[PDB]
Write a structure and sequence with these properties.
Helix content of chain A: 40-55%
Catalytic activity (chains A, B): 2-hydroxyethane-1-sulfonate = acetaldehyde + sulfite + H(+)
Structural class of chain A: alpha/beta
Radius of gyration of chain A: 26 Å
CATH topology of chain A: Anaerobic Ribonucleotide-triphosphate Reductase Large Chain
CATH class of chain A: Alpha Beta
CATH architecture of chain A: Alpha-Beta Barrel
Pathway (chains A, B): Organosulfur degradation; alkanesulfonate degradation
Number of strands of chain A: 17
Family (chains A, B): Belongs to the glycyl radical enzyme (GRE) family.
EC number (chains A, B): 4.4.1.38
Keywords (chains A, B): Lyase, Organic radical, Pyruvate, Transferase
Strand order of the largest sheet of chain A: 4-5-6-14-13-17
Strand content of chain A: 5-15%
Largest interface: A-B, 26 and 25 residues
Distance between the termini of chain A: 40 Å
Oligomer: homodimer
Chain lengths: 798, 798
């Protein structure tokens, strides 16, 4: 059924598809000078008319952005200058490799790359950064490799995570969006330069893009119909005919049944992939809510069954599992180990009126996740103080499957923060999970720019080596904070750290200022803009830097929180306060990676650590967090946004660690940094509840300039076994909620399974582990990232 | 000790003191034409120089606003036109009578009244309301009596509740404030008219009022020294010397000890009473926080003891119990049965950084309340999702004393609402309870105008009688919505009610627009403004309508929620859907107050009722609430404020009830309406937990335009007996917090105690009951308010 589809692409390397990039380029190279949203819309039409449409074997819904099997899509507007080396490197890349046929290689070199030579966003961004910033961003003059210090993330995705107002599609259809746009055009003053230049072309872009997705849908209806006529098996012939009927109706017209709603949404989400490379892949919204009217009505009218609806969802996810986010740059790839994806599916939470939103579909999605073997969908469960008992129990049972699903997002942290930044309560209460851990208001959010990922572990190294890093030798990178062995008090060391920290923040905000102004000259999002109230009201593409009435919620990342906290905690305690070792002795111990210095290494590992509800380390964490909250509060208004400190790592803590030498917390050189706001590996020796408490102690709830923190916690199977274990997990989630923590997600595994899977990859090919907001096959992960997963403390008693 | 003090005025009618009114008037009549804040400051200086200062027997702190015993104060600027009848009527008034000596009456007629003739705020407001509004406001052309329909509340208190930044006094002292203002004057441009007219006179008033309270304090220090020098008892002589020393220092200078902090805060609190008639009497803030540093240091340094500190607290509250809020108009008196008072004292909650704020002083205040027999202080305990267990347990034990202490205010409802209205998280988290149930940010709140109390039970009556009310005969009051016996569907009845409801809202908002602009011409508050950051920054008196950067949080009252919901529920169910009776039968039964129609009365009492978690009624309640939230959201911006629906009754449900005839829910003519957002009398038949859910069901969490709801619940002693009963209350409080409800407070009493005390007041004269955010002696209450307290369901289980 779905296992039949699943057997068809099992254990196959994804291929790179080129049709979208080819026809995008054929259109774009013919429209130079025209308004970018209009060019994008004409290209989407050109794609809609010329790219291959697929009706896939055994499927009940149709729509692809690429070829049979697992595939990815090319985005030359973003990083087309990487196409040459991606041809050479992608098939053999150690992590997340992609195969490329010779035929598709020829189109890239011959039909795609030439136009984009000298026109990509990454070429423009590399030239746009001033030298002081460039040295902290890239390792070479053409910005082909990051230095993993002040890491910009705008050059390996079109935008950050996004959630469409899919329900708008289901209720109105794209023909309705188009007619609104025509009426708006008719109301313009034809004498007005602003109407003629700022209003008309945007609205014309909306009209075309509506015609584009509809024409694309109707080409499926035709293909399905032609197949139905030649189909000999009656059962399949009725299904093909059903496809021809539904796709002739949606997404042009509002959906009439649950099946149409799935296909309408599926069409919208696939075309979204064709339009742009959304960060983490475009997300899916509160499906258990906006599907509910269709599900409820069909269920009552015998049109659908509990099993039949569950079959259609599985049809949707096997398709999602065939689309792989393609990162052709080495920075993008190392941020996204194991074919990383986060097409967040939100279930549960509250309605816009503050009532609990659990419905039967909520439980179906949970069950759907528990019985679909792939690590799809990216299930995110909303928690609030009145989350029902049965719901939390079912959340706990899903967690105890061991695959890491679902991740938990806390209404009690998001809703107050979002109303404090201008959201009506209805908008905040109705938020969707997006990407790793983010909250989105699909008609109020307007910010789309990838933000800095900052390796603050390197900032600490630059204190130890007075502006330099061992990885980069004598390169003049950071502030000349002075010879650390010349510091007489702890306060001088801390100030040294503070100076490096503000240098990185300062660097990052200059990056974002340039990025936010630059992106609008390279990226447009006409289909996404047509589903956004403010875009339509003010005639502005989503990627415009400022949109009236919008709220801009963006990010800068703190990487290595636990690593830095413990290192600083050790230095303060062991070097300055207890004077158990001198600065030179510590530095000497670091310089030789503790080889021959195992005694100091153990001594350093004995100081107070983050994640133990220990105020000695937790006060250091709070002061480090305060630096980023207060910086954001002060300097974000200049950028017309909320640029908030966030602790969501992707898989960057691996490459960020690969460039940071041995640190005062006892961590070995070049190994992964601590993840998100989790405790540093094996530093939580007081149980799992103290991790939640240290996360609380390390925040600054007196100010609003904060976003998510990603928290990874691992239980052993014994610790959560049985009804008593389910009750503990449920209660632990209630405490997480009460503490106003943003996110939590769990692995449930024995250490020996991870070790065995390293010692025998072929045997444990299907082992799935939760990494950072997503799950992947353990055997696809690099040794360094495996070591991150292994060294995470497994809690046995909770 | 304090029992000796309390024995001296036990069971005595308070007297009306005139000194403040005399010396206020002597100054004001000499300063006509000057800017009002400067005049007020000069008036307060004149009082400071001429009014009697008292060193009271057995006391350890000093400061009075009137004569020995229980006393009240006159504020002729507010309602001086009532002085004539207050001379005749107050000593014999049935509720809350005040005695007045013949000499004090002579001061009033001869030295106070003449100047204020034609100058009072009430005279000005009465003339300023247009005829359409006046008919709904007052029952006579000089506005001497309310009609208890659209009741304005600005005319019987200077302002609404208020909380000073007392901690600023303790930490800075008033000399610092004066010096700040002097520098600000020195920095002015002497050529600038705006500096000369808008800045200098405001700052000159701050200088004077700082000198005024300091001079007033030093006269206490002088008198105490003179008494100590003649004191024969060594113990008492030391107390006088301590008083002489402490009062020469505070509030001029920052406090140095716990004793000084109490005396400084007391001075500020008493002088505030001299400055104006704050609503509910000025409130006291989070004393367990800003007293904590002094308590901890002295306690550690052997300077203070738990018992001595508790003694100093009791000295403050016996003083508070001697100050009685004086309402001379009959409206003010009927709103404030039994000498109602709400000098809110806030304990517990969260710090400005979101950490739990329980400390040892928090528990001492609880113990302090449990061992002081009077219904003082007005203890308010803040609740949040992390209220500690021991804290909730001691709160429950205090509740189990049966006196109504403490009232519960829920962070989880207040804090999101306040940051959504512009408060930083630190300001919101640090809020103080003020008055009945309100939250105050002492340097961000700027709104001070009394709002409407709207008798929506009367609005329903105008549907039953097509714009008229039985109490007022043929007086053409409301909208002519038609003969109710002509309504063919429920929707017509509902629409008629909606029309009257909006008439009352429109009326109240015209009142507030006129009131908010009028008050600045009659009231000024120099001492309160000198403690407010925004006042000092922008040189504006607190009672200015608009103050830059301020947040204006005001109110309009819905009275009779339960009464109206159930009446409508009965009409919807019994007349229109089940057709168990005709409209003519219901009206006939109502007009004769059910006499001869007892069966109809019984049938009407059987419909679904609010407070039972019954969506049939709760959905009506939710829709009525939505009417007022949506109206406020739309039309408050015009007023430059948040004019939010609130359900806090004072004791106005008695006078509001006394003008409403028999209602469709079975309530008898002229009896009390339901209180706050509590269930209507005896309508809650499904336990106390369903009241909380119905309060939740009847709200609209999707919008912010909402303020407090006062909730009264009564348990019998049996329900809460023993350790299990304490745990049940703790558990019930968690559910109250989880549901984001604003307020709850409890009576614990047997119905028979209420009946026995009615049949024999002398025997049960000291019985204390929780009424509406405050507690009072049951025997001081009118029969109508006693019947309200008796009819509240006493719950045996939860």
């Amino acid at each position: 059924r779905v296992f039949t589809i699943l057997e068809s692409f099992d254990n196959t390397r994804p291929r790179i598809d080129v049709e979208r990039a080819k026809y995008f380029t054929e259109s774009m190279k013919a429209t130079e000078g025209q308004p970018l949203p209009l060019r994008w819309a004409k290209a989407l039409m050109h794609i809609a008319e010329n790219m291959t449409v697929y009706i896939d074997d055994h499927q009940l819904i149709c729509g692809r952005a690429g070829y049979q099997g697992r595939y990815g899509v090319l985005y030359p507007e973003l990083d087309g200058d990487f196409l040459g080396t991606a041809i050479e490197d992608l098939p053999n890349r150690a992590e997340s490799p992609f195969a490329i046929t010779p035929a598709a290689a020829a189109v890239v070199v011959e039909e795609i790359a030439p136009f984009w030579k000298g026109k990509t966003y990454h070429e423009a961004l590399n030239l746009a950064l001033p030298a002081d910033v460039h040295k902290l961003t890239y390792d070479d003059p053409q910005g082909l490799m990051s230095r993993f210090i002040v890491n910009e993330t705008s050059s390996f995705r079109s935008s950050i995570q996004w959630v469409h107002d899919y329900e708008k599609v289901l209720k109105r259809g794209f023909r309705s969006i188009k007619e609104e746009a025509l009426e708006k055009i008719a109301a313009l003053d034809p004498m007005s330069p602003c109407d003629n230049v700022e209003k008309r072309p945007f609205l014309e872009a909306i009209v075309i893009v509506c015609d584009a997705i509809i024409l694309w849908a109707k080409r499926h209806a035709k293909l399905a119909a032609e197949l139905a006529a030649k189909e000999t098996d009656p059962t399949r012939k009725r299904e093909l005919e059903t496809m021809a009927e539904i796709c002739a109706w949606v997404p042009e017209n509002p959906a009439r049944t649950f099946h149409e709603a799935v296909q309408a949404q599926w069409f919208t989400q696939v075309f979204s992939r064709i339009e742009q490379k959304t960060g983490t892949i475009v997300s899916n919204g509160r499906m258990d809510q906006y599907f509910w009217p269709f599900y409820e009505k069909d269920l009552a009218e015998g049109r659908i069954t509990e099993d039949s609806a569950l079959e259609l969802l599985e049809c949707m996810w096997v398709g999602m599992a065939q689309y792989v986010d393609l990162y052709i740059s080495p920075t993008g790839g190392a941020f996204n180990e194991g074919y990383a994806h986060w097409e967040a599916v939100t279930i549960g939470g509250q309605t816009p009126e503050g009532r609990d939103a659990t419905n039967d579909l909520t439980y179906l999605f949970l069950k759907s996740k528990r019985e679909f073997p792939l690590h799809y969908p990216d299930l995110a469960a909303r928690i609030h103080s009145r989350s029902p008992e049965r719901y939390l129990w079912e959340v706990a049972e899903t967690i105890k499957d061991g695959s890491g699903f679902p991740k938990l997002i806390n209404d009690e942290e998001v809703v107050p923060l979002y109303v404090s930044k201008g959201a009506t309560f209805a908008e905040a209460l109705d938020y969707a999970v997006s990407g790793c851990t983010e909250a989105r208001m699909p008609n109020r959010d307007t910010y789309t720019s990838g933000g800095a990922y900052i390796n603050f572990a390197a900032a600490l190294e630059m204190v130890l080596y007075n502006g330099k890093m061992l990885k980069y030798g004598d390169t003049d990178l950071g502030a000349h904070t002075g010879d650390p062995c010349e510091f007489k008090t702890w306060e001088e060391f801390w100030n040294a750290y503070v100076t490096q920290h503000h240098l990185f923040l300062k660097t990052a905000f200059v990056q974002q200022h340039i990025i936010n102004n630059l992106r609008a000259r390279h990226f447009a999002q006409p289909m996404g803009s047509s589903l956004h109230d403010l875009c339509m009201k003010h005639c502005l593409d989503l990627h415009t830097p400022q949109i009236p009435e919008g709220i801009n919620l963006g990010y800068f990342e703190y990487m290595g929180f636990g690593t830095v906290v413990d290192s600083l905690s050790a230095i303060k305690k062991l070097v300055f306060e207890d004077k158990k070792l001198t600065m030179g002795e510590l530095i000497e111990a670091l310089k030789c990676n503790f080889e021959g210095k195992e005694d100091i290494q153990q001594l350093l590992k004995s100081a107070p650590c983050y994640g133990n509800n220990d105020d000695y380390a937790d006060s250091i964490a709070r002061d480090i967090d305060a630096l980023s909250v207060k910086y954001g509060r002060r300097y974000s208004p200049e950028l017309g946004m909320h640029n908030d400190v966030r602790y969501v790592p992707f898989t960057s803590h691996v490459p960020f660690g690969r460039v940071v030498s041995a640190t005062p917390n006892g961590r070995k050189a070049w190994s992964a940094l601590s993840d998100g706001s989790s405790a540093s590996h094996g530093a939580d020796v007081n149980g799992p509840t103290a991790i939640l408490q240290s996360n609380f102690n390390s925040k600054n709830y007196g100010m609003r300039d904060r976003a998510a923190r990603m928290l990874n916690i691992k239980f052993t199977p014994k610790c959560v076994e049985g009804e008593e274990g389910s009750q503990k997990l449920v209660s632990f989630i209630r405490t997480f909620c009460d503490l106003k923590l943003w996110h939590v997600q769990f692995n449930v595994i024995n250490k020996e399974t991870l070790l065995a899977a390293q010692r025998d990859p072929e045997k444990y090919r299907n082992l799935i582990v939760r990494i950072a907001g997503y799950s992947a096959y353990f055997v696809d992960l690099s040794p360094d990232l495996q070591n991150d997963l292994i060294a995470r403390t497994g809690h046995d008693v909770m």
